[PDB]
Amino acid sequence: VWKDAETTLFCASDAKAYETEKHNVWATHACVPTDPNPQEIHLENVTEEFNMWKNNMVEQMHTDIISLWDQSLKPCVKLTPLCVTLQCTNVTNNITDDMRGELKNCSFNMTTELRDKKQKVYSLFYRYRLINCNTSAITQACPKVSFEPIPIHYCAPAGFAILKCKDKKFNGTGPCPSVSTVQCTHGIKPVVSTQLLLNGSLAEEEVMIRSENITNNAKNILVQFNTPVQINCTRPNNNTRKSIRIGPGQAFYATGDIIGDIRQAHCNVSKATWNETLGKVVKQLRKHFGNNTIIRFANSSGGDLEVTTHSFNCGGEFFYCNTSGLFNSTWISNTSVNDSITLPCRIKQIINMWQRIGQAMYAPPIQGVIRCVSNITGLILTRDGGSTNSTTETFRPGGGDMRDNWRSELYKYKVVKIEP
Amino acid sequence: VWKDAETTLFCASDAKAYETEKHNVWATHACVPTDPNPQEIHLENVTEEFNMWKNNMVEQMHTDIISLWDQSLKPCVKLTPLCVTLQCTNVTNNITDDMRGELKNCSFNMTTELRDKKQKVYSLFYRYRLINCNTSAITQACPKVSFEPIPIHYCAPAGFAILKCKDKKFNGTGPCPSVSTVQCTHGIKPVVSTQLLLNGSLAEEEVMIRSENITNNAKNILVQFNTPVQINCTRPNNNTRKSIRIGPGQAFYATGDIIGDIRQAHCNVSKATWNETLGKVVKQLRKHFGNNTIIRFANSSGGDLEVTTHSFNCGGEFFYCNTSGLFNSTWISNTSVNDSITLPCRIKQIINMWQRIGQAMYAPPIQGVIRCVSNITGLILTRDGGSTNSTTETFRPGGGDMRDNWRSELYKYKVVKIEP
Amino acid sequence: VWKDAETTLFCASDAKAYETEKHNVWATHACVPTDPNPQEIHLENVTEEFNMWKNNMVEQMHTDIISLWDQSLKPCVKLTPLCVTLQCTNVTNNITDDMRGELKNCSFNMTTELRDKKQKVYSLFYRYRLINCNTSAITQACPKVSFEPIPIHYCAPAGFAILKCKDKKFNGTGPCPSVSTVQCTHGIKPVVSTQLLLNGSLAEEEVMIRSENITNNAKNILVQFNTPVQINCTRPNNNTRKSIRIGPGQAFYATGDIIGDIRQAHCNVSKATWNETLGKVVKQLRKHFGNNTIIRFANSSGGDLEVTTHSFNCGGEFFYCNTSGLFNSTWISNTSVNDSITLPCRIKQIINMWQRIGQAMYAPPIQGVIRCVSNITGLILTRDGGSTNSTTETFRPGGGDMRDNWRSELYKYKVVKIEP
Amino acid sequence: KKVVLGKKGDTVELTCTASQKKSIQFHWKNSNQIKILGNQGSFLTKGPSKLNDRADSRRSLWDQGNFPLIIKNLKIEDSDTYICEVEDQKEEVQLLVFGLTANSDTHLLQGQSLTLTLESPPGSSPSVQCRSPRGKNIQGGKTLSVSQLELQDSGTWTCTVLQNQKKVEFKIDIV
Amino acid sequence: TFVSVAPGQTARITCGEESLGSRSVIWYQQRPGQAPSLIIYNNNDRPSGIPDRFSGSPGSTFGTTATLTITSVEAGDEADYYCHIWDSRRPTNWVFGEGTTLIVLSQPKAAPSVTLFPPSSEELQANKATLVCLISDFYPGAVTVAWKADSSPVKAGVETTTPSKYAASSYLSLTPEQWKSHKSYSCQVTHEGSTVEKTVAP
Amino acid sequence: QVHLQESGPGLVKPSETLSLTCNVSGTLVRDNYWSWIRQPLGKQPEWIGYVHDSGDTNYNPSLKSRVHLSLDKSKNLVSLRLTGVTAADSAIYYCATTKHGRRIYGVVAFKEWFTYFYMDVWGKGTSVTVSSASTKGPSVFPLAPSSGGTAALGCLVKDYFPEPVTVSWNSGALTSGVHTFPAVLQSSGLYSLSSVVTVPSSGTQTYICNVNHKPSNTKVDKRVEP
């Protein structure tokens, strides 16, 4: 007897990591070390039926990680008071292209100690007077933290197992020949991104495309790669940390010192991989639903900055990248058809977590010149509903609900229970 | 073996209701659906001894519901800051009877956004300058809530039962012939009122009077009816909802728009039922402790507004009704002796829950013209200690501890445990 | 089979005490009454090996009591706002010795009710204008509390025991002949002090000296006495309680009324006991590690006020005593060599609990003339590393980590588990 | 089978409500089923359509249960049938928008003729009932025009257009 | 210009203007009688077939000149070398930098044979006159030739070959009366630190 | 292997148009940038321009009004035309395969980003001489022996155009002792050269130089005597 769907997930993690960094603090507080036994061991026959996209385990891992995020919001992060009005100016003393600025170095009036005293203070805002924040601002900061995803294992309790499709070619709703039962997963890293999977897991054999409803264009298409497309992101923006402890209740930072005039924040994607991978993707598409069609990739359709750009994080700052460079190639149905692609990005401090309960700020980006090298492990796509007279199919970057990213990770785990 | 008194109560509830409304939110969070099995099944003989008024289950349901009320107090309800001073005026430009007003439309100075800005704002106070609140104010409000009692079932755990006296005529301390054992109750509604039971449960046969000590006048007398006396309460006061979200931490409302000049807040009790019921009550009284006596009913003896009036709720506002109309009849011992009774009521926003940890405000009464039809299911009485030379007995409305209302509801449930 | 080290401690306590007092509130909330069975009963033979100083039970009781202290910090204690600037003056209108003052009666400006009104208010500071507090101030106060250590028993759970060395002469790392197993301890009192144990437990036979490393001078030396040295502490400082409840959120006190001109805060130690005890201590020392040496006792080496003085509490105020009177005797190696010792002490309100998360204030010392009689049950010592040419050994008062005080109390308890 | 009328230029709102009081995924499409607007959990995603520039939805109501669909700067070319994909259900709603255009001069002469042509979507059967500034009823069909006019009718005008038992009114100033 | 070096030693060649902006310098190697061939691109990157003996100076420190270094030089490296400079503050250069000839001194010390012929009687009968200075059997292939009229340097009429595989020629064109006028004319050949002179007279 | 072979007329008159072709194998012309480069005798290379099928094409400004570059995809070749030629245009001309690179920095240094080109495969080159002479025959004079027991002896070949001239001694029966120097191109635009032999001073053998200038159909035999 195998009964499914039980919100019960054990956890596993730790080696050299402890506290400080918020991910490290979290894994430390919610996980115990693992053991290198796990045997799984598939048993002969025992079914061919499965369906990864109706897994409530995903929704569990999701709501868990978010609640944990609030549990991090509790101690140090400041929901108040200082965002009122900003006396900002610009470093532009001569100009072309009407650049204005995303980053501004500003002056302020700040409650320090005692009653109603102020001192002149530097403030930076990522996006002249006023302007403030809109109806919420939690400021994370904190003395000892950081933000890098840490491997988190999900395990089944006592009297429970987890079946696992080891079939390389799964239709997602369908015929699976090899079922095994593991007690604990290998350890999943919590990468929060859209459009591409960064870090994550690779396909064992070939590139695999997966959709909950290949006809319904509103449903996402998790495209998993057998190979990584490079992406190196260098944001050489510089900020010097100054945390003025002037008052007991108050804990203020001061960023925006020095210089270096770094261009925005910068990134790259490396293309050779992107050439073969995109060709092979249109190959898979044309060997699945797309039989004879020219495949075109336009950029994001529009929306919130988190939706229009590849919004991901390089250690707690929220990067937004113009994504035209990833989606600007028309793939000819007839046949297939040192330079690197350089993508324009921006660092944000003010992000909107949760629902609207509050905004989250990583206030003092420490140091400067911080490059994050990543492996493009993925694509999350939504199809542009087209016609058949166009003799072409258009595909756009979609996403937003990270639960889709977990289905893209938790695709081979379904918690089950055993009965005599 | 039957051992009693265990603070362990399972719960049951839900059909079409979900969240939003606070009662709905509560039942949703603290209850699971039920099953329409319950068989109870009385067993032949097995005792005649019982005592409803020494049940700690009542004290449990009570403390539970109150703690739950605080659990509702947590997220949205605002204990601070704005109650300081009020710049109020009156809509009376010509006058009789020196009415002043219970309701006032007022002007204010309000922190909106940023640092130390204000805007002119409407404010209503239910009860000229100043005045404020006394040493606490929690303001409930909230975007999605309401307040209507929801059926809550109390069940016994594993290895436990609940004996239930199905005897129609119980002396309350006494001889009960039919004991049954149910797993879960039929579902009790949390009606918070004094003097009358509204909604609640009816007596199966005749009217039943119940007292913990019929001699001790300090002990309450739960008078349960076999029939409901009508009570229709129309408060046609109008308020237009305006929730100005000016600042992140601040969430302010604005009531007191429009007009209609509604008389206070109004109510009615329907009398024919009240005639027969009161006659029959003096009948029961004269067939119990009152053998030969003229029975008189004076109004409330005095105290807090919650004690002097029939303080109940029509959806979260606290109604106070002049109760002379209910208690103004002298019942002659000799023999017995379309018009409806109309009762004057008032809506309050500022109530005192708990102990004095804080006041609770339902700040934006939404819409206007809201009529609540209710069934008078009850009387809670306290006797006025009289003499025997008066050749009359006087009875006054008492109450206050809602636990008495639960004994008036939890009268047929006593959690018990089984042993071999 | 006996396996050790399990963070699982049952608790026991209560007789006549309830709530109010914080210790009473704590024992009430974390303990259940006990039973006067416990039989322990040593079993013949069954080992001679033990080591009291590597007990994680101590670290458990410690972290527990501290976390409990924060749990007391939660409801009433005020981390904010009023400490800004103080307008203080002195009662000295003529002077000798440049006394200044530790205690000052001061004037203030205080938010009472409404918005931005103040009233002239008395304030006392234990240690002229300004000065305030440094970067944190929690103010305990509260309507109903107090602070007197309450007996707390530590018990082993189910399937667990606690071995107990009843050997009068234990080397601390070593040979123990009599092991017994109790379910629950006799009840340990939480006395927070340094240098001396106050209340606490006495040695059954002779005076026993105990050290984790008798060679390492950095390791503490818990000197346990078979007899108590008296210490009577009379602080006849007077303060009249005035708690002005002016505003809802605000709860302010007012101390510093009346007079009496009490000298600081005063104390005594009674010496005859101190004579024999110190002689016997140098006796034990010379019969252990000190064979032929003149033993000298200098005062505290320096540091924080909690380290330089015998920092202990007389009911929630933190006393600091000049300790030269305890350590000012040179003990001649040759042979041994009504008046009472009077020690100068000071009462503090501002103490630093925890780590630096915040300072704790007992704000309204109530009444005046409060004498605490105590039994000197102890010494915590650190050795001054000397030479052998000096032909003398110097010993200084050390301490600070209260866990040492618990090892000094939890010395005969080690939680163990049983297996077939 | 829902009918919602709309004025040209003015903003309009299309509703979509679910049984669950949470916030599950929903998507809006036209009669040809082309993406207009949708959501990815807590994000608003716009589709490749003509409404893309003038379409949005209040994110506040999402977590409550219902998901709206507003269309600003309304035009007649936007008249179409829409659907909503929530809880595996298809809430269909037909949007029929109309407009009014005055061909005759804004400053008419003494005793002339008023010409008014209404903008109608391809394949429609409109019905208009106009009214004078004071008291006179005007009826018609495809085009409504009054031949005989007087100086007394100088002022505000009121014309009502009815379709599928739903009616909307227009106001124009004629001097 | 010219740079000479012994086998096994290190040669360095400077080319182009001092840097102004950021640089990408391209180096090409051209063997005698061959098309130019490359050496380096992107300041220090090499194409297929080029060993790491060849290195270029970074496009780096402002106000400096690009340099090509060749370590462990062999006779095969003897060639003309050219750079093509890309500088972010300068226009596209459409002309390569001036070339440098690398000489690898595998062999020393052979001294030239010089022979000097007066004008022939037949040429004189044709009212022309040419002095012929033949230079041969010398290595390395660097000589300069100068002519003298009596003691005076000749400013005109001298034509001299670039030597090849070495041999070289110098011709002084004169009129018959110029020839007959002076006491003598001299051919002076300068080779490897020394100068050999021969003289001729009517 | 990518292989380029240039061809052209070898000789062009002043004011005429020079037309050159670069035949390409081992790659298709559409898939590369192509650069013409020129290099005069004794000078550094002088480029010409680069062309691409995309239209990403540019010419040396100094040659701008006179130069045209083209690609012929059907024949897989690259072409150059240069109008109004003069002697200054005399050079060896090369066709090349031109690769593109970018210097890319941080965005703070965006103004300093730039592209550069390098020529990675060159053809063997084609020689182009522009001058004005139809033909000119040489004048041949004997260089008489006069003076190790050995004397030198020669023939002067004066003022001819164009190259080349062949000189032999005794019809070929004297190749030892023989040194025929490379010609000098004089400021007159004419060439001259000399040939010498070294012989024992003692009246046996007869010494005759045979000079042939094919372009002018000139052959001269000149006896050389003391």
Instruction: Please report which helix (H) or strand (E) contains residue C56, including its range.
Output: helix C56-73
CA distance A116 to chain C (A): 10
CA distance A260 to F112: 15
Q: For E113-200, which CATH superfamily applies?
A: Immunoglobulins (2.60.40.10)
Q: In what order do the strands lie in the sheet with C160-165?
A: C2-4, C414-418, C160-165, C179-182
- In this complex, which of B79, B84, B135 lies closest to C115 when CB atoms are compared? B84
The counts of H helices and E strands in chain A are 5, 28
Q: Chain F residues within 8 A (CB-CB) of chain A?
A: 101-102, 104, 106-110
CA distance F33 to F54: 9
- In this complex, which of D38, D43, D48 lies closest to A304 when CB atoms are compared? D43
For residue E136, the cross-strand partners are E113
Cβ–Cβ contact F142 with E under 8 A: yes
Chain D residue closest to A308 (CA)? D45
Which positions in chain B touch C113 (Cβ < 8 Å)? 84, 132
CB contact under 8 A, A114 and C85: yes
CATH 3.40.1350.10, domain A193-238+263-401, yes or no:
no
Residue bearing tokens 């009781």: C61
* D132-151 as b/e: b if 16+ CB within 10 A: beeeeebeeeeebebeebee
Give the D window 16-75 contacts with A, CB below 8 Å. 23, 25, 27, 29, 33-35, 38-48, 52, 59-60, 63
Contacts across the B-C interface (CB distance below 8 Å): 18
Contact yes or no for F158/F141 (Cβ under 8 A): yes
- In this complex, which of E37, E164, E167 lies closest to F122 when CB atoms are compared? E37
Q: What's the fold here for domain C1-83+133-191+402-420? A: HIV Envelope Protein Gp120; Chain G (2.170.40)
CA distance F119 to C104: 89
CA distance C348 to C317: 6
The total domain count for chain F is 2
DSSP per position, chain D: --EEEEESSS-EEE--B-SSSS----EEE-TT--EEEEESSS-EEE-SSSSTTTEE--GGGGGGTB--EEE-S--GGG--EEEEEETTEE--EEEEEEEEEE-S-SS--TT--EEEEEE--SS---EEEEE-SSS-EEE-SSEEEES---GGG-EEEEEEEEETTEEEEEEEEE-
CA distance F20 to F33: 17
* A272-294 as b/e: b if 16+ CB within 10 A: ebbeebbebbbbebbeeebeebb
Q: What's the fold here for domain D3-97? A: Immunoglobulin-like (2.60.40)
Residue spans of the domains in chain D: they are 3-97, 103-174
Q: How was this structure determined?
A: cryo-EM
**CATH number, domain with residue F210:** 2.60.40.10
Instruction: Please report which helix (H) or strand (E) contains residue B246, including its range.
Output: none
CA distance C20 to chain B (A): 17
CA distance B225 to B315: 24
Burial of F137 (0-12, 13-18, 19+ CB in 10 A): middle
For residue C236, the cross-strand partners are none
CA distance D52 to D36: 7
Residue spans of the domains in chain C: they are 1-83+133-191+402-420, 193-400
CA distance E7 to A186: 61
Backbone angles phi, psi at F158, to 5 degrees: -105, 135
Strand pairing category for F91-103 and F33-39? antiparallel
Number of Cβ within a 10 Å radius of residue A4:
14
- Token pair belonging to B392: 């009359």
CB contact under 8 A, E82 and F182: no
Cβ–Cβ contact D171 with B under 8 A: no
Which positions in chain F touch A346 (Cβ < 8 Å)? none
Number of Cβ within a 10 Å radius of residue B255:
20
- Token pair belonging to E48: 């297929």
**Probe site for chain B from C113, C117, C244 (most B CB atoms < 10 A):** C113
Chain C residue closest to B84 (CA)? C114
Which positions in chain A touch F101 (Cβ < 8 Å)? 338
Which positions in chain A touch D43 (Cβ < 8 Å)? 303-304, 306-307, 399-401
**Probe site for chain D from A215, A300, A318, A355 (most D CB atoms < 10 A):** A355
DSSP per position, chain F: --EEEEE--SEE-TTS-EEEEEEEESS-GGGSEEEEEEE-TTS--EEEEEE-TTS--EE-GGGTTTEEEEEETTTTEEEEEE-S--GGG-EEEEEEEEEEEEE---GGGGGG-EEEEEEEEE---EEEEE---S-B--EEEEE------EEEEEEEEEEEBSS--EEEEGGGT--SSEEEPPPEE-TTS-EEEEEEEEEE----S--EEEEEEGGGTEEEEEE---
Cβ–Cβ contact F61 with E under 8 A: yes
Task: Say if residue F44 is in the same domain as residue F103.
Answer: yes
Half-sphere exposure of F77 (CA within 13 A, CB side): 10
Locate the DSSP E strands across A166-284.
179-182, 208-211, 221-224, 229-238, 242-244, 252-254, 265-270
CA distance F118 to F49: 12
Which contacts of C304-309 are long-range, i.e. CB under 8 A and separated by 24 or more positions?
Answer: C305/C348, C306/C194, C306/C351, C306/C352, C306/C400, C307/C194, C307/C399, C307/C400, C309/C345, C309/C346
CB contact under 8 A, D27 and A355: no
A touches F (3+ CB pairs < 8 Å)? yes
CA distance F189 to F161: 8
Range of the domain at F67: 3-130
CA distance A369 to chain F (A): 10
Q: Could you tell me the end-to-end alpha-carbon distance of chain B, in angstroms, rounded to an integer?
A: 7
Contact yes or no for F187/F196 (Cβ under 8 A): no
Cβ–Cβ contact A263 with F under 8 A: yes
CATH 3.20.20.10, domain D103-174, yes or no:
no
The domain boundary residue, chosen from F82, F110, F130: F130
CA distance C93 to C195: 38
Strand pairing category for E158-160 and E152-153? unpaired
For residue D146, the cross-strand partners are D114
Return the DSSP state at B118: E
**Probe site for chain E from F141, F146, F193 (most E CB atoms < 10 A):** F141
Chain B residue closest to A86 (CA)? B114
Q: Which class would CATH give E2-104?
A: mainly beta
Chain C residue closest to B132 (CA)? C114
D touches B (3+ CB pairs < 8 Å)? yes
Contacts across the B-D interface (CB distance below 8 Å): 7
Binding partners of C (≥3 Cβ pairs within 8 A): A, B
Chain D residue closest to A394 (CA)? D48
Which positions in chain D touch B17 (Cβ < 8 Å)? none
- In this complex, which of C115, C245, C248 lies closest to B133 when CB atoms are compared? C248
CB contact under 8 A, E115 and F196: yes
CA distance D19 to chain B (A): 10
Return the DSSP state at A147: -
CA distance B378 to chain C (A): 38
CA distance B112 to chain A (A): 10
The counts of H helices and E strands in chain C are 5, 28
A touches B (3+ CB pairs < 8 Å)? yes
Q: Which CATH architecture has domain C193-400?
A: Beta Complex (2.170)
D touches E (3+ CB pairs < 8 Å)? no
- In this complex, which of A132, A135, A358 lies closest to B114 when CB atoms are compared? A132
CB contact under 8 A, F107 and A263: yes
Q: For B193-240+262-401, which CATH superfamily applies?
A: Human immunodeficiency virus 1, Gp160, envelope glycoprotein (2.170.40.20)
Chain A residue closest to B246 (CA)? A135
Which positions in chain C touch A115 (Cβ < 8 Å)? 84-85, 109
CA distance B159 to chain A (A): 24
**Probe site for chain C from B78, B84, B121 (most C CB atoms < 10 A):** B84
